[PDB]
Amino acid sequence: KEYQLKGLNWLANLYDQGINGILADEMGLGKTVQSISVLAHLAENHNIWGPFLVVTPASTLHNWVNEISKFLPQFKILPYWGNANDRKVLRKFWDRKNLRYNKNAPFHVMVTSYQMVVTDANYLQKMKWQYMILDEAQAIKSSQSSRWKNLLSFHCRNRLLLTGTPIQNSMQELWALLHFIMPSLFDSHDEFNEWQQLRRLHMILKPFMLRRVKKNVQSELGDKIEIDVLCDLTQRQAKLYQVLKSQI
């Protein structure tokens, strides 16, 4: 019922090319809604009701499984949180074998976060998947990140990314991004830094990113205006700043 159907058709064509898609649009347009529309269209197209990995920061885990609950009740939900006995009964819930596609299993849709992915890599190194969706991808901006190291060992062969602002421009986050989308082609960062600097950089990533903005629909949203409030230093604050500048 929106123009995100064109986006899902575009990424479906991009996946039909055989390379990995990228979504870099900000939050507010319903990226969860287009994600579940993508899941439903891929279940209708290739007849796949099997694994679908979701990685998400801890605040939006329950919101995403909630919208899973009252959007499409056809799939089966298997969350990943709790204590150690809850961890092992959830581990016995996804005792899967023989791979490929399944119809009747309780592991249809499942979510997790970055932390227990990082600290339980031995329990997730096996049982290989087909879809890798991680939301809010600004946390893999570090070049020596351990969670980056324990996601790079995955044989999932899918690199769909959901994030709002990938534009941190930290000269290695974008290199880690380009290494994430194509792992085989891009491995040397020195040659990446080796190869007018503003025009070429926009055509570097041109067939990957889709161009969408907030100012395209009719604005019932509110049209947020930044109202700066400026203060003057009080007596204790002035004395503390005098002391702090005396220490410097």
Side-chain angles (χ1 to χ4, degrees), residues 2-59 61-95 97 99-117 119-156 158 160-171 173-189 192-223 225-235 237-243 245-248:
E2 66 268 4
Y3 53 90
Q4 269 58 40
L5 309 185
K6 175 67 59 178
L8 79 92
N9 291 351
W10 153 81
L11 60 60
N13 198 11
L14 203 171
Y15 172 59
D16 280 21
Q17 310 173 298
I19 54 142
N20 309 313
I22 277 291
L23 180 95
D25 271 309
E26 59 266 6
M27 205 33 208
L29 306 103
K31 317 198 309 166
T32 60
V33 200
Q34 65 158 263
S35 206
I36 51 99
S37 288
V38 156
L39 200 139
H41 210 33
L42 277 206
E44 286 156 335
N45 276 21
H46 317 306
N47 200 20
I48 298 296
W49 273 26
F52 274 121
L53 257 300
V54 179
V55 202
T56 289
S59 306
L61 294 174
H62 200 204
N63 195 11
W64 223 343
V65 299
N66 187 230
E67 76 90 9
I68 279 311
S69 68
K70 66 310 204 186
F71 266 33
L72 305 310
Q74 300 117 4
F75 324 111
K76 269 170 259 171
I77 175 58
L78 218 64
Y80 284 74
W81 43 65
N83 289 337
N85 43 359
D86 201 9
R87 259 173 274 270
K88 60 179 72 77
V89 69
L90 280 168
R91 274 192 285 236
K92 84 85 190 193
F93 267 177
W94 69 286
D95 270 317
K97 215 56 77 62
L99 260 203
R100 304 187 193 209
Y101 152 75
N102 73 84
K103 162 76 212 61
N104 278 354
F107 99 109
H108 283 187
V109 289
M110 59 297 192
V111 303
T112 182
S113 161
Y114 302 92
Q115 297 95 0
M116 62 320 297
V117 158
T119 194
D120 293 314
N122 49 329
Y123 307 99
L124 295 174
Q125 203 42 67
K126 346 175 174 195
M127 326 267 195
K128 298 309 329 172
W129 309 122
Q130 78 264 39
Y131 221 129
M132 200 70 287
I133 299 172
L134 53 101
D135 198 12
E136 276 83 51
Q138 311 95 228
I140 321 90
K141 61 156 79 58
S142 170
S143 62
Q144 321 286 340
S145 163
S146 62
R147 65 223 319 117
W148 187 29
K149 298 313 168 191
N150 52 65
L151 53 85
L152 257 167
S153 61
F154 262 33
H155 207 262
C156 169
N158 208 333
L160 174 66
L161 288 186
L162 300 201
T163 180
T165 78
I167 201 54
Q168 276 86 351
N169 55 90
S170 172
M171 65 49 49
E173 163 205 67
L174 307 107
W175 166 246
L177 164 85
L178 283 176
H179 179 46
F180 192 110
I181 312 144
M182 317 69 62
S184 78
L185 313 171
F186 285 83
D187 289 284
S188 56
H189 90 101
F192 150 76
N193 289 314
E194 274 324 289
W195 48 242
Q196 86 294 311
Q197 75 265 27
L198 302 172
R199 288 171 196 201
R200 194 250 177 170
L201 255 292
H202 202 220
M203 292 51 278
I204 277 173
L205 77 154
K206 185 61 218 64
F208 304 102
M209 140 183 159
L210 71 153
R211 301 213 240 199
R212 292 185 170 152
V213 84
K214 273 289 166 58
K215 325 285 193 180
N216 50 3
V217 305
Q218 44 93 27
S219 306
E220 78 278 314
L221 216 168
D223 303 285
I225 299 170
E226 194 57 281
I227 315 180
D228 293 11
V229 187
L230 185 93
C231 303
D232 301 49
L233 222 50
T234 63
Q235 309 281 337
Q237 289 172 335
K239 289 153 55 60
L240 277 182
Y241 176 77
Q242 160 257 335
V243 164
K245 210 167 182 301
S246 84
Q247 294 317 111
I248 285 301

